[PDB]
Design an enzyme around this catalytic site. Structure first.
Site, PDB file in Angstrom:
ATOM      1  N   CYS A 105       0.841  -1.203   0.000  1.00 19.58           N
ATOM      2  CA  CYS A 105       0.000   0.000   0.000  1.00 19.58           C
ATOM      3  C   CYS A 105       0.880   1.258   0.000  1.00 19.58           C
ATOM      4  O   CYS A 105       1.567   1.502  -0.987  1.00 19.58           O
ATOM      5  CB  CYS A 105      -0.991  -0.055   1.169  1.00 19.58           C
ATOM      6  N   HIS A 125      -0.153   1.348  -3.464  1.00 24.97           N
ATOM      7  CA  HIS A 125      -1.497   1.858  -3.674  1.00 24.97           C
ATOM      8  C   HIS A 125      -1.450   2.895  -4.801  1.00 24.97           C
ATOM      9  O   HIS A 125      -0.498   3.675  -4.866  1.00 24.97           O
ATOM     10  CB  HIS A 125      -2.047   2.524  -2.414  1.00 24.97           C
TER      11      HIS A 125
END
Ligand SMILES: [Cl-]
Ligand SMILES: [Cl-]
Lengths: 187, 187
Positions: A105, A125
């Site tokens: 992420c 992400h």
């Protein structure tokens, strides 16, 4: 001996990205230490789940080496990891001893902060791409999980199972990963 | 007013099935209370993640009613929920006031224990089917998420995102659920 994983837990970490890998790694028979960046005390995650670490990072870092160092995401969690001299030292040691580093992420942006694994293919992400790519030190991937040698990255809460199973596969092999996967009822 | 969710957290709960719904529900702007079955103290989950509840169930149960009562799974967690007179009372009140009840994995077997929602279609973890179906009080489904009126069930750690988003959709609508889903990077 059983493989060992260090999961570094900072305030503002994404709790799903922390718990899914810890749980899946333990299902794989890996000894996981959830280490609190700030110390021994409970950690307030991004969505206010409060997790009690197994140890402080200060203590856990003296019990190395680990077969994998895992960096959860969460924007604020990753910023805390990025600012930490202790994390810098751990990651540099892991890179030097040719050990797996896994980040998800916003987590991979701590690799940038600490100058780890430049010249790799990485994913993050979508909203963390620009931060990760500042300076062009990595090549960006949109794969849900990316693995370039010993740098293993992934994208978000929804890729956490794939991320964790990829770590299991890297450490314990494809068959163990498949065995651990089946009871999870993944799609 | 914002919707409210009660997540009942017992020793041996599956931590992924606890944290994913708590986090996703909070992303949806739902006020979530993580309530400890045993009291106020930290809870040791099935894979040894230790979570600090927001309140004891004893205290949280006096702050009802809630728009949804959520039962995580984990074999031992669900057994603890099934044995609890407090859980029985909460579920019966929720059923009476025509409120949503959501349970995942082994979680739905607590509905059986407390005689909740008989005559519904339900799903569970494959390994929890026989326990759930003892007496034929429900009709079994293999859908990853099942919803029969106010009884919403799901299958395992790997269906936790779908389960949580189904709760969001039931409470706040399809558009909010879609909005919350996008940043998660689900497949
Ligand atoms: Cl975040
Ligand atoms: Cl379990």
């Amino acid at each position: 001996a059983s493989k060992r994983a260090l999961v570094i837990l900072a305030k503002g970490a994404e709790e799903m990205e922390t718990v899914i890998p810890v749980d899946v790694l333990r299902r794989a028979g890996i000894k996981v230490t959830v280490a609190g960046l700030a110390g021994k005390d409970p950690v307030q995650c991004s969505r206010d789940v409060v997790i009690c670490p197994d140890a402080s990072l200060e203590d856990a870092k003296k019990e190395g080496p680990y077969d994998v160092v895992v960096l959860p995401g969460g924007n604020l969690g990753a910023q805390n990891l990025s600012e930490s001299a202790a994390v810098k030292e751990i990651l540099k040691e892991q890179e030097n001893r040719k050990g797996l580093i896994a980040a998800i992420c916003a987590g991979p942006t701590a690799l940038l902060a600490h100058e780890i694994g430049f010249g790799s293919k990485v994913t993050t992400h979508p909203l963390a791409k620009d931060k990760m790519m500042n300076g062009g030190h990595y090549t960006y991937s949109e794969n849900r999980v990316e693995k370039d040698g010993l740098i293993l990255t992934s994208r978000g809460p929804g890729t956490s199972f794939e991320f964790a199973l990829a770590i299991v596969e890297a450490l314990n092999g494809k068959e163990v990963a498949a065995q651990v996967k089946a009871p999870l009822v993944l799609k």
